[PDB]
Design a protein around this ligand. Structure first.
Ligand SMILES: [Mg+2]
Ligand SMILES: [Mg+2]
Ligand SMILES: [Zn+2]
Lengths: 60, 128, 204, 80, 146, 113, 99
RNA sequence: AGAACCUUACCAAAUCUUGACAUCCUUUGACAACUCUAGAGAUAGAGCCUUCCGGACAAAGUGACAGGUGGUG
RNA sequence: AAGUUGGGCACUCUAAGUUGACUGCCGGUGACAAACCGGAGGAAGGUGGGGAUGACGUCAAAUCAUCAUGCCCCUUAUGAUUUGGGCUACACACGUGCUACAAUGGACAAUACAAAGGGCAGCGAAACCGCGAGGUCAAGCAAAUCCCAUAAAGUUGUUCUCAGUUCGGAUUGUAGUCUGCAACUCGACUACAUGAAGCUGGAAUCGCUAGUAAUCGUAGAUCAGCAUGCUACGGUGAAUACGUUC
């Protein structure tokens, strides 16, 4: 994301509906997970590094 | 008492079966088997162990069954009745085993695979 | 094409670097951890840090730093570690406790090797020699196997390429095997060069 | 607002502009960016210059137009 | 590119008529796993056949299948007449019975199935025609039997 | 014959009433309930007193020409006022915001490759 | 008057060792303890696209599984209450005591 | 893995040029959550008026500098 | 009323630790081999089912729009802010889906059986009101407790009776509900009316070897609202595989 866009997301909007989530690590607009506040790419990177508590590869 | 107890599991259904001297009446969840289960074919399945051991009419079956559906619950009973029959007489194993009643059916629902529409079904492919 | 070795074995043979339980504030705690980890990396660049383990309990952050050079981080009178702690305390409202663990063998550590090879490449060291010296030193230390790779415009070449060297055994497919993997980047004038190190120390 | 409990939606600036114009018979054009505003009975006889995204297009309210939005009477896309 | 033959699944006898074949017929009639509707159609058809025939439903059904099942069939290799296996014979008989019943004009499946089973017992159904046609084309290719 | 329409005699009156414009399944069930005429009775087996009872109720509902005329005027109004919906009625394109890159065949008619 | 302890952790080894400790301390204080009864594990599965751009069909699945243990202190004794609060468990485990 | 605004980038109109955003430097202390007016809003002008620990943090000006989902996979 | 409580932990289940499958044992075959076939026992037999895990390389294959980065370019503008519009266009062509073309069905009524998930200012019961979508009040519940949430197909009746229909449900009118700052462009859902094509699909072409295909519902992420998509879940549950010329 552009620095201005990240800034604008952080600023309080005129309306609540206008507020949107971005990835806190990189600012990616799409595919942001609520629990971790991370996009799909960032979540994967941190899970691999063992830096997300409790999260491991799933097999069944 | 003279109660013989066996547990049968089929698919996601489990049945707790109690075999007691009786007329051959089957009661499932405090309801008649014929009321409980839709088809008479299902009844033939659960009475199969009795036929193999020739113990038909000797026992009244009281069943507490949970999970799955009518077929699973019915075939869950078959496994439980056979397991109870073994408790009643160890001699019956040969007959029950030969029929394959003793085996628990390991077949279960296969998970959906990511990138597939189902466990095995694939999206319609078009070259070009 | 290849899974991250750490990622595959995390939660199987390797424990999570982060060791805390949260539900409502999981996102907040994670992001606080991320800012701390970033700060430490920049603060202790000179010091050789393999990894940082963070434990959160009783509104207190417990930080375990594994460093090749313990003296640099701690400071002569423990001043440097206190300074780091105070800086961390400004960042995080919770009290921060820092523990410094020395690494006996820097060469057996993948991150330290990867960072070293990257730093040498930035100094215009030959890509081939740097990998070869790294594998030799690790094998002398008794590592069962080591793999080292450098990728990019290795010699300032217009076309990028990846060269790798290996010694002993690195069983990536074996889940039991504990393999230390790290990637580092060399910011060369020609471009970014990526260095990956796989180290199999072996069972005990 | 579609729900009846909430009244028809009008932007205050639009409504106030019309209400000021009530006094004089010789009405003047009202420039608006409010495509979303409902056309009230009061609006009858007024010409609203509603923005189409590039230009304000003259829209003159008639009795039938009441209950429809101002945006409905100014197109945003052009075809053939 | 195949390892070998795979063991076939087995069916319990039909409760009402005590025939394995009856169970297999239900399986061919069944659509989308809806066993009950299939069983319902078959049992009702067997009632209608007995009612009209005045003979045991299983008897006429057995007589019907015997007429439909084919001894010889052509296989592309020139088409060569080949002996249908006993298990294949049943598959073709049941498949043809149900398929040709579905093509009959009666409003309900049960009536169509009963008319077909009755006709096949008299050796006059569309399924019977299918066997006859199969046998004809096999005889035409008798020279290629070798 | 009800509301100027000769409804099918053979069918049950619940269904037969729906062959009138402005009357569907829901309305037909209401009108029979008000008239206290059975749904099951076929129109051929309907009685004159019953028919009159039904006719009273159907007179209550706007139907056939009355409804057709109303619907047309609403659409004509939209077209006259130059509403977005009205313009799409004129153009024969989807009026209720459906996409037109594909489909829209019911409104656009058959394909004109 | 049963003191209930609920334990939740992402790893079972930590939860089990913590469970043993809390049970022991209370039993040492002489309070009767029933458990540690194992509550059904909770697993949250996250499915993400592996690639950065396109390639929908390739997916990676991750799971976070919470292991739950229930411990009940049948008899409350002054020593037990203080000891249970006093016990320091590993950082991972989360303990909730209802008295 | 959620385009009515937002997202959003693209277009049109209305606007700004140390800048929406960072660090430093000089100066000051409240910086404003608030109300009212004109504005489509951005915003501007009137109100006020509260808060601040060597020394915190936040404003004003200017320059070092910022900004780019611009290009090249 | 009811596992509802009194009680019990039998059972079931939950989940930790262990036992079990290794060609181990026994027949033949085979090179004194590896293997092979068959059998015994066993819940399971020959890597039991499924998953994760993808060698050296290939396509200068994708991504400078996640991010980062060499170089290049812009910098009172290729940066920045706001309102509105667009990304939703529509003579057409294609891919992937959804729903149908009915009687193995439609409608109506009565009556059973799951699994796997989600929830804090969130899930929201019961009750009352509305035809309904919903509204009002409000219990419980940070979870094996409460709530989402009654699975549906199914089973048993009643009715329709082979036609563009009591099939199908597009479209359009009108009157509403809800979310939201605001549903005009451009939301979802409801009620009433309306009632298109469609009669099983040319050339051609796709998936699947068993708890699979087919079919039926269920849940989740994203998310104010918004799913015929995606990812999971169980219920019912087949047909066929001679064989390797093509
Ligand atoms: Mg490339
Ligand atoms: Mg688009
Ligand atoms: Zn990110």
């Amino acid at each position: 994301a552009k620095t201005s866009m990240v800034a604008k997301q952080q600023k309080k909007q005129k309306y609540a509906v206008r507020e949107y989530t971005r990835c806190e690590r990189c600012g990616r607009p799409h595919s942001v997970y609520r629990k971790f506040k991370l996009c799909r790419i960032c979540f994967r990177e941190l899970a691999y590094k063992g830096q997300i508590p409790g999260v491991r590869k799933a097999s069944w | 008492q003279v109660e013989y107890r066996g547990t049968g599991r089929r698919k996601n259904s489990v049945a707790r079966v109690r075999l007691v001297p009786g007329e051959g009446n089957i009661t499932v969840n405090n309801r008649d088997v014929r009321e409980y289960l839709p088809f008479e074919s299902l009844i033939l399945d659960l009475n199969q162990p009795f036929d193999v051991t020739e113990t038909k009419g000797n026992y009244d079956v009281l069943v507490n069954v949970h999970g799955g559906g009518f077929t699973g619950q019915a075939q869950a009973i078959r496994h439980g009745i056979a397991r109870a029959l073994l408790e009643a007489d160890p001699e019956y194993r040969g007959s029950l085993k030969r029929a394959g009643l003793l085996t628990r059916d390991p077949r279960m629902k296969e998970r959906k695979k990511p990138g597939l529409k189902a466990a095995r079904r694939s999206p319609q492919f078009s070259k070009r | 094409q290849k899974i991250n070795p750490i990622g595959l074995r995390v939660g199987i043979i390797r424990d999570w670097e982060a060791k805390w339980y949260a539900e409502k504030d999981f996102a907040s705690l994670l992001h606080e951890d991320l800012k701390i980890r970033k700060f430490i990396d920049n603060e202790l660049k000179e010091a050789s840090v393999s990894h940082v383990e963070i434990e959160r309990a009783a509104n207190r952050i417990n930080i375990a730093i594994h460093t090749g050079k313990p003296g640099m981080v701690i400071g002569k009178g423990g001043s440097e570690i206190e300074k780091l702690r105070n800086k961390l305390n400004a960042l995080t409202d919770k009290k921060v406790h820092i523990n410094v663990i020395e690494i006996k063998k820097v060469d057996l550590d993948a991150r330290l090797v990867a960072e070293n090879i990257a730093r040498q490449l930035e100094n215009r060291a030959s890509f081939r020699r740097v990998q070869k010296q790294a594998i030799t030193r690790a094998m002398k230390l008794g590592a069962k196997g080591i793999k080292t790779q450098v990728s990019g415009r290795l010699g300032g070449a217009d076309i990028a390429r990846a060269e790798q060297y290996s010694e002993g055994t690195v069983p990536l497919h074996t889940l039991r095997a504990d393999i230390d993997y790290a990637h580092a980047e060399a910011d060369t004038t020609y471009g970014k060069l990526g260095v990956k190190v796989w180290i199999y120390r072996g069972e005990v | 607002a579609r729900s009846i409990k909430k009244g028809p939606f009008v932007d205050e600036h639009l409504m106030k502009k019309v209400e000021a114009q009530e006094g004089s018979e010789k009405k003047q054009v009202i420039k608006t960016w409010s495509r979303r505003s409902t056309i009230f009975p009061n609006f009858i006889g007024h010409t609203f210059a509603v923005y189409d995204g590039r230009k304000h297009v003259p829209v003159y309210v008639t009795e039938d137009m009441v209950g429809h939005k101002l945006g409905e009477f100014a197109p945003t896309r052009t075809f053939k | 590119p195949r390892k070998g033959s795979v063991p076939k699944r087995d069916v319990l006898p039909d409760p009402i008529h005590n025939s394995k074949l009856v169970t297999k017929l239900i399986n061919k009639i069944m659509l989308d796993g809806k066993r009950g509707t299939a069983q319902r159609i078959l049992y009702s058809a067997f009632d209608l056949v007995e009612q009209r025939s005045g003979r045991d439903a299983l008897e006429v059904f057995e007589e019907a299948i015997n007429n439909i099942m084919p001894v010889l069939e052509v296989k592309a290799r020139y088409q060569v007449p080949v002996e249908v296996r006993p298990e294949r014979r049943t598959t073709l008989g049941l498949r043809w019975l149900v398929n040709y019943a579905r093509l009959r004009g009666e409003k309900t499946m049960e009536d169509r199935l009963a008319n077909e089973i009755l006709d096949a017992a008299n050796n006059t159904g569309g399924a019977v025609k299918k066997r006859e046609d199969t046998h004809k084309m096999a005889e035409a290719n008798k020279a290629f039997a070798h | 014959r009800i509301a100027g329409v000769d409804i099918p005699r053979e069918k049950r009156v619940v269904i037969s009433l729906t062959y009138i414009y402005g009357i569907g399944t829901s309305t037909a069930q209401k009108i029979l309930e008000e008239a206290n005429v059975s749904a099951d009775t076929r129109v051929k087996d309907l009685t004159d007193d019953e028919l009159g009872r039904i006719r009273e109720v159907v007179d209550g509902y706007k139907v056939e020409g009355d409804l057709r005329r109303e619907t047309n005027l609403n659409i004509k109004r939209l077209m006259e006022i130059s509403s977005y919906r009205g313009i799409r009625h004129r153009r024969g394109l989807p009026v209720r915001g459906q996409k037109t890159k594909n489909n829209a065949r019911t409104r656009k008619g058959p394909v004109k490759t | 008057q049963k003191i209930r302890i609920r334990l939740k952790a992402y790893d079972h080894r930590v939860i089990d060792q913590s469970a043993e400790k809390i049970v022991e301390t209370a039993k040492r204080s002489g309070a009767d303890v029933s458990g540690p009864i194992p509550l059904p594990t909770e697993k949250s599965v996250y499915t993400i696209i592996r690639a950065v751009h396109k390639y929908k069909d390739s997916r990676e699945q991750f799971e976070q599984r919470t292991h739950k243990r229930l411990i009940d202190i049948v008899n409350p004794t002054p020593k037990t209450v203080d000891a249970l609060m006093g016990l320091n468990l590993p950082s991972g485990v989360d303990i909730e005591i209802k008295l």
